[PDB]
Amino acid sequence: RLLGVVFELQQPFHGDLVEQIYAAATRRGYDVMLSAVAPSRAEKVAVQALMRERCEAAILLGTRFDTDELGALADRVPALVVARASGLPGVGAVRGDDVAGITLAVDHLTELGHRNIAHIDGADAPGGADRRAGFLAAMDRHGLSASATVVTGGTTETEGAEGMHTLLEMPTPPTAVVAFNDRCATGVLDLLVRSGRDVPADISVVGYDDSRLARIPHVQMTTISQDATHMAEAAVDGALAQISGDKAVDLVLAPHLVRRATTGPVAH
Amino acid sequence: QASSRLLGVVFELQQPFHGDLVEQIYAAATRRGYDVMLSAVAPSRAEKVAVQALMRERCEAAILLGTRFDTDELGALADRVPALVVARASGLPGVGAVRGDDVAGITLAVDHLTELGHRNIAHIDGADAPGGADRRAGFLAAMDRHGLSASATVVTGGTTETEGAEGMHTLLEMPTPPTAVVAFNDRCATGVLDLLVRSGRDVPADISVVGYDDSRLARIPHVQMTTISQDATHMAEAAVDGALAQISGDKAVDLVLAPHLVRRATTGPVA
């Protein structure tokens, strides 16, 4: 028996999810067929490749498929999306509570004394809208709506670095930054150290995903974990349940704060 | 039903260079009318488990990227399906291989650095990872050719940013730290650069750094890492053709490809 999985080849978070989906699938007696998405291999191609095999289900990690696309897919095989809502009643989803996640980051920073906090969003990437919304609501909750900045970013290191550059040029640069994800925060960190600014002595930085990048010994990035192990187990069980005939579900998992060494007392 | 031919590909999840090779293999495969079935290797999923997984499929060949299988494991695999390893020698007749000329590659790195005036040059090797021994021997040979055997340093490293950092730390503690460092691969170099910048040292002003693979890490706009390319696209096409050739019944070949230097901003004249 086979479960189809579409993931992004150069994405750390998808790497964790995939490794965990393989283990969950095996525990359930299922094999996995991976179909990679890459700059030269569109998601439509990767998804279409799984259709060429005996996949009993299709699990799309952070898919950018529109409602029509997912509908067309759901018409051919049980489908479930990971790290984002499906938008369609018949397409299941296993995602992280992005709004609660970002809120943990902000709460953590305001508790350390930070008032001027910025966010480098993930643009139109899955989860970007929610974290952006969560960031703003979280700052408001602390009565810091006035000192909250949001700059467009992305999912890569460059967008992280450009975002941080932009922020440093602000009339009043932030003392803390919440990057869209870990790869993005890596870029933020790289720019800060090269610019003579110490983390956290001068600026605190928080990432998202708790990927291999965050646990690197000399980086020790504070970040939000989405619990890749349970998300993967839920995704697999979710797909196997839809295969059995059960109704598609929108499961939201709670994230947790992972404190390392990139955040600390606000300066001065 | 038999109108869709499969090529099996075993690779390391989250390994930059395997990601580049996989992307290109998919493309080369498609150009030849073949689909690709990936089977990933990860800490919780042994390469042995990944290969058996491919066996439960209709793969007409198995392409292993940087495999760690010994003669016996490879042999057993070759007895079930034509096989070809990438980025290393098979060490077995009947098992094809498509790899870069590691000795030649590191020699380019060394020639580039000595040409820029560097003499105290260090190499953080890849330990026992595929390519490790060759780049280490190639490094020492090249240093000797330039009359620098007495100012050549080799420290045991690895393939991750952590070994890069640790190896660089070790090198900085030395009586006579090196002015240039050739890392095993780009990910290792990433750690070297991370440590150097956090230590207040400028690259290349104070110290020059060279990576290997020319992976996405090296081209990142703010990293701009001088590195050695293995030409992933050509390596991927060659691996696919070698596999399709072995399926056609042709004898297994050990194809060695020439690498080239890709200069960016992490190397420069010696301080």
Coordinates of C-alpha atoms in Angstrom, one line a residue:
Chain A
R1 CA 0.0 0.0 0.0
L2 CA 1.2 3.5 -0.8
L3 CA 0.8 7.1 0.4
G4 CA 1.8 9.9 -1.9
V5 CA 3.7 12.9 -0.5
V6 CA 4.6 16.2 -2.3
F7 CA 7.3 18.2 -0.5
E8 CA 9.8 21.0 -1.3
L9 CA 13.3 19.7 -1.9
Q10 CA 15.2 22.6 -0.4
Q11 CA 12.9 23.2 2.6
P12 CA 14.2 22.3 6.1
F13 CA 10.7 22.1 7.6
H14 CA 9.5 19.8 4.8
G15 CA 12.6 17.7 5.5
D16 CA 11.5 17.2 9.1
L17 CA 7.9 16.5 8.1
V18 CA 9.0 13.9 5.4
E19 CA 11.3 12.1 7.8
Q20 CA 8.4 11.8 10.3
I21 CA 5.8 10.9 7.7
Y22 CA 8.0 7.9 6.6
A23 CA 8.2 6.7 10.2
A24 CA 4.4 7.2 10.9
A25 CA 3.5 5.6 7.6
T26 CA 5.7 2.5 8.3
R27 CA 4.1 2.2 11.8
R28 CA 0.8 2.1 10.1
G29 CA 1.9 -0.5 7.5
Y30 CA 2.1 2.0 4.6
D31 CA 4.9 2.9 2.3
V32 CA 5.5 6.4 1.0
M33 CA 6.0 7.7 -2.5
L34 CA 7.8 11.1 -2.5
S35 CA 7.4 13.5 -5.4
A36 CA 9.7 16.6 -5.0
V37 CA 8.9 20.2 -5.9
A38 CA 11.8 22.3 -7.0
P39 CA 12.6 25.5 -8.9
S40 CA 12.6 23.4 -12.2
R41 CA 9.8 21.0 -11.2
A42 CA 6.4 22.6 -10.5
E43 CA 4.0 21.4 -7.9
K44 CA 1.5 20.5 -10.7
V45 CA 4.1 18.2 -12.2
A46 CA 5.0 16.6 -8.8
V47 CA 1.3 16.1 -7.9
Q48 CA 0.6 14.7 -11.4
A49 CA 3.4 12.2 -10.9
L50 CA 1.8 10.6 -7.9
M51 CA -1.3 10.1 -10.0
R52 CA 0.8 7.8 -12.2
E53 CA 1.3 5.4 -9.2
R54 CA -1.0 3.4 -6.9
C55 CA -1.2 6.2 -4.2
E56 CA -4.3 5.6 -2.1
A57 CA -3.9 9.2 -0.8
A58 CA -2.1 12.4 -1.5
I59 CA -0.5 14.5 1.3
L60 CA 0.6 17.9 0.2
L61 CA 3.1 19.8 2.4
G62 CA 2.5 23.5 2.2
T63 CA 0.8 23.3 -1.2
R64 CA 0.1 26.5 -3.2
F65 CA -2.8 24.8 -5.0
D66 CA -5.9 26.9 -5.4
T67 CA -9.4 25.6 -4.5
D68 CA -10.0 24.5 -8.1
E69 CA -6.7 22.7 -8.2
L70 CA -7.3 20.9 -4.9
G71 CA -10.8 20.2 -6.0
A72 CA -9.7 18.5 -9.2
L73 CA -7.2 16.5 -7.1
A74 CA -9.7 15.5 -4.5
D75 CA -11.9 14.3 -7.4
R76 CA -9.3 11.7 -8.2
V77 CA -7.9 10.7 -4.8
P78 CA -8.4 11.3 -1.1
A79 CA -6.4 14.5 -0.4
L80 CA -5.0 16.2 2.7
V81 CA -2.8 19.3 3.0
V82 CA -0.2 20.0 5.7
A83 CA 0.8 23.3 7.3
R84 CA -2.2 25.2 5.8
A85 CA -6.0 25.0 5.6
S86 CA -7.3 23.3 2.5
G87 CA -10.2 25.7 1.8
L88 CA -12.3 22.8 0.6
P89 CA -14.6 20.7 2.8
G90 CA -13.5 17.4 1.3
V91 CA -9.8 18.1 1.5
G92 CA -8.4 17.4 5.0
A93 CA -5.7 19.5 6.7
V94 CA -3.2 19.1 9.5
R95 CA -1.7 22.5 10.3
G96 CA -0.1 24.4 13.2
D97 CA -1.8 27.1 15.1
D98 CA 0.2 29.9 13.5
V99 CA -1.6 32.7 15.3
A100 CA -0.9 31.1 18.7
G101 CA 2.7 30.4 17.6
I102 CA 3.6 34.0 16.8
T103 CA 1.8 35.0 19.9
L104 CA 4.1 32.8 22.0
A105 CA 7.1 34.6 20.4
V106 CA 5.7 38.1 21.1
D107 CA 4.7 37.2 24.6
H108 CA 8.2 35.8 25.2
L109 CA 9.8 39.1 23.9
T110 CA 7.5 41.5 25.7
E111 CA 8.3 39.5 28.9
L112 CA 12.0 40.3 28.4
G113 CA 11.2 44.0 28.1
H114 CA 11.0 44.5 24.4
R115 CA 8.5 47.1 23.2
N116 CA 9.8 47.9 19.7
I117 CA 9.3 44.5 17.9
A118 CA 9.2 43.9 14.2
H119 CA 8.0 41.0 12.0
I120 CA 9.5 39.9 8.7
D121 CA 6.5 38.1 7.2
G122 CA 6.4 35.2 4.7
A123 CA 4.6 37.2 2.0
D124 CA 2.0 35.0 0.3
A125 CA 3.6 31.7 1.5
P126 CA 1.5 29.2 3.4
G127 CA 1.1 30.5 6.9
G128 CA 2.2 34.0 6.1
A129 CA -1.2 35.7 6.4
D130 CA -1.9 34.1 9.8
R131 CA 1.4 34.9 11.4
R132 CA 1.2 38.5 10.1
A133 CA -2.3 38.7 11.6
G134 CA -1.2 37.0 14.8
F135 CA 1.8 39.3 15.2
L136 CA -0.4 42.5 14.9
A137 CA -3.0 41.2 17.3
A138 CA -0.4 40.0 19.8
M139 CA 1.3 43.5 19.8
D140 CA -2.1 45.2 20.2
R141 CA -2.9 42.8 23.1
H142 CA 0.2 44.2 24.9
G143 CA -0.7 47.8 23.9
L144 CA 2.3 48.1 21.6
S145 CA 0.4 48.6 18.3
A146 CA 2.4 51.8 18.1
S147 CA 5.8 50.2 18.1
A148 CA 5.1 47.2 15.9
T149 CA 6.6 47.0 12.4
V150 CA 6.0 44.5 9.7
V151 CA 8.1 44.2 6.5
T152 CA 7.5 41.9 3.6
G153 CA 9.9 39.0 3.6
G154 CA 9.8 35.4 2.5
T155 CA 11.0 31.8 3.1
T156 CA 14.6 32.2 2.2
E157 CA 17.8 33.7 3.8
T158 CA 18.0 36.6 1.4
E159 CA 14.5 37.9 2.2
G160 CA 15.4 37.6 5.9
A161 CA 18.6 39.6 5.3
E162 CA 16.9 42.2 3.2
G163 CA 14.1 42.5 5.7
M164 CA 16.6 43.1 8.5
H165 CA 18.5 45.6 6.4
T166 CA 15.3 47.5 5.8
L167 CA 14.4 47.5 9.5
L168 CA 17.9 48.8 10.6
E169 CA 17.2 51.8 8.3
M170 CA 14.1 52.7 10.2
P171 CA 14.0 56.0 12.2
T172 CA 13.7 53.8 15.2
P173 CA 14.9 50.2 14.5
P174 CA 13.3 47.3 16.5
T175 CA 15.1 45.7 19.5
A176 CA 13.6 42.3 18.6
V177 CA 12.6 40.6 15.4
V178 CA 10.2 37.7 14.7
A179 CA 11.2 36.2 11.3
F180 CA 8.8 34.1 9.2
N181 CA 10.8 30.9 9.6
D182 CA 14.3 29.6 10.6
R183 CA 15.8 29.9 7.1
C184 CA 14.6 33.5 7.0
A185 CA 16.0 34.1 10.6
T186 CA 19.4 32.7 9.5
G187 CA 19.6 35.5 7.0
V188 CA 18.6 38.0 9.7
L189 CA 21.3 36.7 12.0
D190 CA 23.9 36.7 9.2
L191 CA 23.2 40.4 8.5
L192 CA 23.3 41.5 12.1
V193 CA 26.7 39.9 12.9
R194 CA 28.2 41.2 9.7
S195 CA 26.9 44.7 10.7
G196 CA 28.5 44.7 14.1
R197 CA 25.3 44.0 16.1
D198 CA 25.4 41.3 18.7
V199 CA 22.5 38.9 19.2
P200 CA 20.9 39.1 21.8
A201 CA 23.0 41.9 23.4
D202 CA 21.7 44.4 20.8
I203 CA 18.8 42.6 19.1
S204 CA 16.8 39.5 19.9
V205 CA 15.7 37.2 17.1
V206 CA 13.1 34.5 17.0
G207 CA 12.6 32.0 14.2
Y208 CA 9.9 29.5 13.3
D209 CA 9.8 25.7 12.7
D210 CA 12.6 24.5 15.0
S211 CA 14.4 23.0 12.0
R212 CA 18.0 21.7 11.8
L213 CA 19.1 25.3 11.3
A214 CA 17.9 26.4 14.7
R215 CA 19.7 23.7 16.7
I216 CA 23.1 24.3 15.1
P217 CA 25.4 24.6 18.2
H218 CA 26.9 28.0 17.3
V219 CA 23.6 29.5 16.2
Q220 CA 21.3 28.3 19.0
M221 CA 18.1 30.0 17.7
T222 CA 15.1 30.6 19.8
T223 CA 12.2 29.5 17.7
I224 CA 8.7 28.1 17.6
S225 CA 8.3 24.3 17.1
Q226 CA 5.2 23.0 15.3
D227 CA 6.0 19.5 16.5
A228 CA 6.9 17.8 13.2
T229 CA 6.5 14.4 14.7
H230 CA 2.9 14.7 15.8
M231 CA 1.9 16.8 12.7
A232 CA 3.2 13.9 10.5
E233 CA 1.5 11.3 12.6
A234 CA -1.8 13.3 12.4
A235 CA -1.3 13.8 8.7
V236 CA -0.9 10.1 8.0
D237 CA -3.7 9.1 10.3
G238 CA -5.8 11.8 8.7
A239 CA -5.2 10.4 5.3
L240 CA -5.8 6.8 6.3
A241 CA -9.1 7.9 7.9
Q242 CA -10.3 9.6 4.7
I243 CA -9.3 6.4 2.8
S244 CA -11.5 4.4 5.1
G245 CA -14.4 6.7 4.3
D246 CA -14.4 9.1 7.2
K247 CA -15.1 12.8 6.6
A248 CA -12.1 15.2 5.9
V249 CA -11.1 17.2 9.0
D250 CA -9.3 20.5 9.7
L251 CA -6.9 19.6 12.6
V252 CA -5.0 22.4 14.3
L253 CA -2.1 21.5 16.5
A254 CA -0.6 23.7 19.2
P255 CA 3.0 24.9 18.7
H256 CA 5.5 25.4 21.5
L257 CA 8.2 27.9 22.3
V258 CA 11.8 26.6 22.1
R259 CA 14.2 28.9 23.9
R260 CA 17.9 28.8 23.0
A261 CA 20.2 31.8 22.9
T262 CA 19.1 34.4 20.3
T263 CA 16.7 36.2 22.6
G264 CA 17.3 38.1 25.9
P265 CA 16.8 41.3 28.0
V266 CA 16.1 44.3 25.9
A267 CA 19.2 46.5 25.7
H268 CA 19.9 49.7 27.8
Chain B
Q1 CA 1.1 -0.2 -17.3
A2 CA 4.7 -0.7 -18.6
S3 CA 4.4 2.6 -20.4
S4 CA 5.9 4.3 -17.3
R5 CA 9.5 3.2 -16.6
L6 CA 10.9 3.9 -13.1
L7 CA 14.4 4.8 -12.0
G8 CA 15.1 4.5 -8.3
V9 CA 17.1 7.2 -6.5
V10 CA 18.4 6.9 -2.9
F11 CA 19.5 10.3 -1.4
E12 CA 20.1 12.1 1.9
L13 CA 17.2 14.2 3.1
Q14 CA 18.3 17.8 3.7
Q15 CA 21.7 17.4 2.1
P16 CA 22.3 20.4 -0.1
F17 CA 24.3 18.7 -2.8
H18 CA 21.8 15.7 -3.0
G19 CA 19.0 18.2 -3.4
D20 CA 20.7 19.7 -6.5
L21 CA 21.5 16.3 -7.9
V22 CA 17.9 15.1 -7.3
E23 CA 16.4 18.1 -9.0
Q24 CA 18.6 17.6 -12.1
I25 CA 18.1 13.8 -12.1
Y26 CA 14.3 14.3 -12.3
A27 CA 14.8 16.6 -15.3
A28 CA 17.3 14.3 -17.1
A29 CA 15.0 11.4 -16.4
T30 CA 12.0 13.2 -17.9
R31 CA 13.9 14.1 -21.0
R32 CA 14.5 10.4 -21.5
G33 CA 10.9 9.3 -20.8
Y34 CA 11.5 8.0 -17.3
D35 CA 9.9 8.7 -13.9
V36 CA 11.8 8.8 -10.7
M37 CA 11.0 7.2 -7.4
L38 CA 12.9 8.7 -4.5
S39 CA 13.6 6.8 -1.3
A40 CA 15.1 9.0 1.4
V41 CA 17.9 8.3 3.9
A42 CA 17.7 10.2 7.3
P43 CA 18.9 9.7 10.9
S44 CA 15.8 7.7 11.7
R45 CA 15.8 5.9 8.3
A46 CA 18.8 3.8 7.5
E47 CA 20.0 3.6 3.9
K48 CA 19.5 -0.1 4.2
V49 CA 15.8 0.6 4.9
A50 CA 15.6 3.1 2.0
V51 CA 17.0 0.6 -0.5
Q52 CA 14.7 -2.2 0.5
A53 CA 11.9 0.3 0.0
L54 CA 13.0 0.8 -3.6
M55 CA 13.0 -3.0 -4.1
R56 CA 9.3 -3.1 -3.3
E57 CA 8.9 -1.1 -6.5
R58 CA 9.3 -1.6 -10.2
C59 CA 12.6 0.2 -10.5
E60 CA 14.6 -0.8 -13.6
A61 CA 17.8 0.6 -11.9
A62 CA 18.9 2.0 -8.6
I63 CA 21.0 5.2 -8.4
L64 CA 22.5 5.7 -5.0
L65 CA 23.7 9.2 -4.2
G66 CA 26.8 9.2 -1.9
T67 CA 26.0 5.7 -0.7
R68 CA 27.9 4.2 2.3
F69 CA 27.2 0.6 1.3
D70 CA 30.3 -1.7 1.4
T71 CA 31.2 -4.2 -1.3
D72 CA 28.9 -6.8 0.1
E73 CA 25.8 -4.6 0.4
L74 CA 26.4 -3.2 -3.1
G75 CA 26.9 -6.7 -4.5
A76 CA 23.7 -8.0 -3.1
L77 CA 21.9 -5.0 -4.5
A78 CA 23.5 -5.4 -7.9
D79 CA 22.3 -9.0 -7.9
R80 CA 18.7 -7.8 -8.0
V81 CA 18.8 -4.7 -10.2
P82 CA 21.3 -2.7 -12.2
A83 CA 22.9 -0.2 -9.9
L84 CA 25.0 3.0 -10.1
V85 CA 26.5 5.1 -7.4
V86 CA 27.1 8.8 -7.6
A87 CA 29.8 11.0 -6.0
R88 CA 32.0 8.0 -5.3
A89 CA 33.6 4.9 -6.8
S90 CA 31.6 1.7 -6.6
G91 CA 34.6 -0.4 -5.9
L92 CA 32.9 -3.2 -7.7
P93 CA 32.8 -4.3 -11.4
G94 CA 29.2 -4.4 -12.6
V95 CA 28.2 -1.4 -10.5
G96 CA 28.5 1.8 -12.4
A97 CA 29.6 5.1 -11.0
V98 CA 29.5 8.8 -12.0
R99 CA 31.7 11.0 -9.8
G100 CA 33.7 14.2 -9.8
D101 CA 37.5 14.2 -9.9
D102 CA 37.9 15.1 -6.2
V103 CA 41.8 15.2 -6.4
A104 CA 41.6 17.5 -9.3
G105 CA 38.9 19.6 -7.6
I106 CA 40.8 20.3 -4.4
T107 CA 44.0 20.9 -6.5
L108 CA 42.1 23.8 -8.2
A109 CA 41.2 25.2 -4.8
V110 CA 44.8 25.0 -3.7
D111 CA 46.2 26.4 -6.9
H112 CA 43.8 29.3 -6.7
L113 CA 44.9 30.1 -3.1
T114 CA 48.6 29.8 -3.7
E115 CA 48.2 32.0 -6.8
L116 CA 46.7 34.6 -4.5
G117 CA 49.8 34.3 -2.3
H118 CA 48.6 32.0 0.5
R119 CA 51.1 29.6 2.0
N120 CA 49.7 28.6 5.4
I121 CA 46.7 26.8 4.1
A122 CA 44.4 24.5 6.0
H123 CA 41.9 21.8 5.0
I124 CA 39.0 20.7 7.1
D125 CA 38.4 17.2 5.7
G126 CA 35.2 15.1 5.4
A127 CA 36.4 12.3 7.6
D128 CA 35.1 9.0 6.1
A129 CA 32.3 10.6 4.0
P130 CA 32.4 9.8 0.3
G131 CA 35.1 12.1 -1.2
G132 CA 36.8 12.6 2.1
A133 CA 40.0 10.5 1.6
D134 CA 40.5 11.8 -2.0
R135 CA 40.1 15.5 -1.2
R136 CA 42.5 15.0 1.8
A137 CA 45.1 13.2 -0.3
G138 CA 44.6 15.7 -3.1
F139 CA 45.0 18.6 -0.7
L140 CA 48.3 17.3 0.7
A141 CA 49.6 16.5 -2.7
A142 CA 48.8 19.9 -4.1
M143 CA 50.4 21.6 -1.1
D144 CA 53.5 19.5 -1.6
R145 CA 53.7 20.4 -5.3
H146 CA 53.9 24.1 -4.3
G147 CA 56.6 23.4 -1.7
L148 CA 54.2 24.0 1.2
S149 CA 54.1 20.7 3.0
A150 CA 55.5 22.3 6.1
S151 CA 52.7 24.9 6.3
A152 CA 49.9 22.6 5.3
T153 CA 47.3 21.7 8.0
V154 CA 44.6 19.1 7.9
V155 CA 42.0 18.8 10.6
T156 CA 39.3 16.1 10.8
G157 CA 35.9 17.7 10.0
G158 CA 32.7 16.5 8.5
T159 CA 29.8 17.5 6.2
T160 CA 27.9 19.8 8.5
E161 CA 28.2 23.4 9.7
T162 CA 29.2 22.2 13.2
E163 CA 32.4 20.5 12.0
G164 CA 33.2 23.5 9.9
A165 CA 32.9 25.7 13.0
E166 CA 34.8 23.3 15.3
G167 CA 37.5 22.7 12.8
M168 CA 38.0 26.5 12.3
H169 CA 38.1 27.0 16.0
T170 CA 40.8 24.4 16.3
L171 CA 42.7 26.1 13.5
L172 CA 42.5 29.5 15.1
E173 CA 44.0 28.1 18.3
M174 CA 47.1 27.0 16.5
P175 CA 50.6 28.5 17.0
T176 CA 50.4 29.7 13.4
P177 CA 46.8 30.0 12.2
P178 CA 46.2 29.6 8.4
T179 CA 45.4 32.5 6.2
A180 CA 43.2 30.3 3.9
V181 CA 41.0 27.3 4.5
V182 CA 39.6 24.8 2.1
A183 CA 36.4 23.2 3.7
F184 CA 35.2 19.7 2.8
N185 CA 32.0 21.0 1.3
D186 CA 29.8 24.2 1.2
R187 CA 27.8 23.3 4.4
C188 CA 31.1 22.8 6.2
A189 CA 32.3 26.2 4.8
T190 CA 29.1 27.8 6.1
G191 CA 30.2 26.9 9.6
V192 CA 33.7 28.2 9.0
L193 CA 32.4 31.6 7.8
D194 CA 29.9 31.7 10.7
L195 CA 32.6 31.2 13.3
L196 CA 35.1 33.6 11.6
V197 CA 32.6 36.5 11.3
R198 CA 31.5 35.9 14.9
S199 CA 35.1 35.9 16.0
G200 CA 35.6 39.4 14.5
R201 CA 37.7 38.2 11.5
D202 CA 37.0 39.4 8.0
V203 CA 36.6 37.1 5.0
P204 CA 38.5 37.4 2.7
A205 CA 40.4 40.4 4.2
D206 CA 41.9 38.4 7.1
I207 CA 41.2 34.8 6.0
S208 CA 40.1 33.2 2.7
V209 CA 37.6 30.3 2.6
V210 CA 36.8 27.9 -0.2
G211 CA 33.9 25.4 -0.2
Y212 CA 33.0 22.5 -2.5
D213 CA 29.9 21.5 -4.5
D214 CA 28.6 24.9 -5.6
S215 CA 25.3 24.3 -3.9
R216 CA 22.6 26.8 -3.1
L217 CA 24.4 27.7 0.1
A218 CA 27.3 29.2 -1.9
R219 CA 25.3 31.3 -4.3
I220 CA 23.2 33.0 -1.6
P221 CA 23.6 36.8 -2.2
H222 CA 25.1 37.7 1.2
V223 CA 27.3 34.5 1.4
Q224 CA 29.0 34.6 -2.0
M225 CA 31.2 31.6 -1.4
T226 CA 34.1 30.7 -3.6
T227 CA 33.7 27.0 -4.2
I228 CA 34.4 24.1 -6.5
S229 CA 31.6 22.9 -8.9
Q230 CA 30.9 19.3 -9.7
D231 CA 28.4 20.4 -12.3
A232 CA 25.3 18.8 -10.9
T233 CA 23.4 19.0 -14.2
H234 CA 26.0 17.1 -16.2
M235 CA 26.5 14.7 -13.3
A236 CA 22.8 14.0 -13.1
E237 CA 22.4 13.5 -16.9
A238 CA 25.5 11.1 -16.9
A239 CA 24.1 9.1 -14.0
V240 CA 20.7 8.7 -15.8
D241 CA 22.4 7.7 -19.1
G242 CA 24.7 5.3 -17.3
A243 CA 21.7 3.7 -15.6
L244 CA 19.7 3.5 -18.9
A245 CA 22.8 2.1 -20.5
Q246 CA 23.1 -0.7 -17.9
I247 CA 19.5 -1.5 -18.3
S248 CA 20.1 -1.8 -22.0
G249 CA 22.7 -4.4 -21.1
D250 CA 25.8 -2.3 -21.5
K251 CA 28.8 -3.0 -19.2
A252 CA 29.1 -0.8 -16.1
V253 CA 31.3 2.2 -16.3
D254 CA 33.2 4.3 -13.8
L255 CA 32.8 7.8 -15.2
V256 CA 34.9 10.6 -13.7
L257 CA 33.9 14.2 -14.4
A258 CA 36.1 17.3 -14.3
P259 CA 35.2 20.0 -11.8
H260 CA 35.7 23.7 -12.1
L261 CA 36.5 26.7 -9.8
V262 CA 33.7 29.2 -9.1
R263 CA 35.1 32.4 -7.7
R264 CA 32.9 34.6 -5.6
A265 CA 33.8 36.8 -2.6
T266 CA 35.3 34.6 0.1
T267 CA 38.8 34.4 -1.3
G268 CA 41.4 37.1 -2.0
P269 CA 45.1 38.1 -1.6
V270 CA 46.8 37.0 1.6
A271 CA 46.8 39.5 4.4

